[PDB]
Structure formats: structure tokens, C-alpha cells
Amino acid sequence: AQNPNCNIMIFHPTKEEFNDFDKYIAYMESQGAHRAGLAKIIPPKEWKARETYDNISEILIATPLQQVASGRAGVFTQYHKKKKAMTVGEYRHLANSKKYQTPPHQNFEDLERKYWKNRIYNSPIYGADISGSLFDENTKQWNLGHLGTIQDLLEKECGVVIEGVNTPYLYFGMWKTTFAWHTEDMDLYSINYLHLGEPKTWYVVPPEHGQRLERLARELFPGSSRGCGAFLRHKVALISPTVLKENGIPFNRITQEAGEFMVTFPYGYHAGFNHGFNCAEAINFATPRWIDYGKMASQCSCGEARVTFSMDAFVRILQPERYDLWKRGQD
Ligand SMILES: O=C(O)CNC(=O)C(=O)O
Ligand SMILES: [Mg+2]
Ligand code: NI
Ligand SMILES: [Zn+2]
């Protein structure tokens, strides 16, 4: 078996290898990459997402989210308070203000120490889940607005035509903005490109060990667990690397820099934080190997997780027994 310790793998495709997206994903999996839950892909040196980022300031963040924490430094939840609309130029100025800017630090490890010590004492503002793309239409390779759709994959593998669409989303971050422990909707893959700015640190649990993370989360968030049988779908819970180590949970970490892609694999729990002002683009995708994960994915039926129009069809076709109860949650 390849990559039996489930380490995060880093790939450096040539421009020739960067032509065929599906083929490269299948290659990475042939080397065991999926066992980690997360891989990094450094694009060929000749490739670019677009010519410049000079003209993005007028993108609107219609509903910036203030991420307010509760709990202890290593075990906390966050709630998202809605704020008034602002442009990306206005958000960048806010991220760079004395109140929100990255503190002085020695290196990424020192900054990670400072994040886990101090995150709960601040409420950074995140622009999340903004439908759109920053890839130039002329970028033909690994353009996250031009991928094969999940509805087309399901149709190709299973023969069933379904409604729904698959588009990318933009993320504008600042120091301490946080993504909670989660897998993707329907345990899909994700791909994330860091277009510009400061890094993003990721933590990930190997898919084969995801249930260990779930059992710890039920112990650490016991009222949330009683409220919902898949409460990590709410995307609110954080657990630090120190707490994971104290409880024997297998995980890995890596820092993504501007210009780099990350891929998350089916049922790879992940969480992380931004180092300073940045912009990322991400989308879900599927492969043939995903189908069985989609059939087994947990679902939130308490009604908190509330997700896209296109997830309906996935549940209806892959999980017809759950359909009924999951849609009672979504209506
Ligand atoms: O970058 C972010 O805030 C969160 N993104 C992801 O969870 C992803 O790409 O799967
Ligand atoms: Mg603009
Ligand atoms: Ni994700
Ligand atoms: Zn729920």
C-alpha cells in the first residue's frame, strides 16, 4: 500500500502533466496521496491563474462574518455574526489595521503558537462563500471555473441525469480567520487555490481515521452531539493540535502559500487558519472513487447545516432512505 503512514504529499507537475486534471488526480492517488486527506500541488513555473491582481478591490463582500469564539483556547466553538457589506478594498484596509493585523513573529511555527494561544480573545472578520472566480478565462489548466461538474460525474458513473450546478467560491481572509473541523458536503473532494496574500495553515485527519476525530468531538462538545448526530456539519468546532495529540488522534499539518493548490479527499476532516490578508478560491469535485463515500456520508437533519440546492439531488439519488428526513431538516 502506498503512503501507509498517511503523510501529506507535495506534487510538482510539469506543464505537460498539468493538462489533464482528472488524470493527475488519479496519479496522485496511485502514489497514496488520498490516504492523508490533503495534498499540495505546486503549479508548473510557466503557469499563472491570471495576469495581475491589480483590479479586484471592487468585488463586494455582501455579508462579512465576524467569527466570535466561546470555550477554551484549545477547544472552542465559533459563531458567525453578520456585518455590513464592504468591498475587497475596504476589507483589505481593515485586515491591515492595527486591531486586526498579523503580529510580529519569527516564522510560521511561532505564528501557529500565537494563533492557538490567543485566537479565542479576538473576533476576526471573514468574507466567505462568495460565488465567483478569479481565474482568467484564458487559463486552460486547473481553472477552477472550468472543471467537469459533479452532476456530470454522477451521470457518467451511474447513468442518472440530475439537476444542479457546481460553481466556485471566493474567500477573503485576515489574521486568525478560522475554518472549523469538517468534511465536504456529501464527503466530496475540494480543491483550493490561494490566489494572493498571506498563507493558510491546514490540519487534516486521514480518512481512514475520521471516526476517531468524531468520537473525540462527541466527548468535547457533548451538548452539540446530543442535538445532532452529525454536528461537525455545522462547521463551528475547533480542536487544537495539542488537544488532538493528548487524545491520540492521528493528524498532519501543512502551510499553503500564495500560488499553491490544495486538494482535500473524500472524508478527510480538515480545519485551519489564515496568517493575514489573503484571497482563496475553492470548489468541490468528484471522481469515480468518491461515489461510495457519497453513499455513506453523514448528514445533519437538525436543520442547522442548511446547504445548496445541488446537494438535494445527491442525497435523493445516493441516499434515498435518508432523503425524507434530510429534506425535513432543509425545509
Ligand atoms: O479556505 C477556507 O476558508 C476553507 N476552505 C476549505 O475548507 C476547502 O477548500 O475545502
Ligand atoms: Mg474590482
Ligand atoms: Ni473544506
Ligand atoms: Zn445538525
Curated annotation (Swiss-Prot):
Modifications after synthesis and translation: Ubiquitinated via 'Lys-63'-linked ubiquitin chains. Deubiquitinated by USP14 with the help of TRIM14 leading to stabilization.
Keywords noted in UniProt: ADP-ribosylation, Chromatin regulator, Dioxygenase, Iron, Metal-binding, Nucleus, Oxidoreductase, Transcription, Transcription regulation, Ubl conjugation, Zinc
GO biological process, one term: inflammatory response
JmjC domain residues: 136-302
Entry's Gene Ontology cellular component terms: blood microparticle; chromatin; nucleoplasm; nucleus; pericentric heterochromatin; site of double-strand break
UniProt enzyme class: oxidoreductase
Compartment annotation: Nucleus
Ligand binding (Fe cation): H182, E184, H270
Catalytic activity: N(6),N(6),N(6)-trimethyl-L-lysyl(9)-[histone H3] + 2 2-oxoglutarate + 2 O2 = N(6)-methyl-L-lysyl(9)-[histone H3] + 2 formaldehyde + 2 succinate + 2 CO2
Protein name: Lysine-specific demethylase 4D
Covered range of the whole protein: 11 to 341 of 523
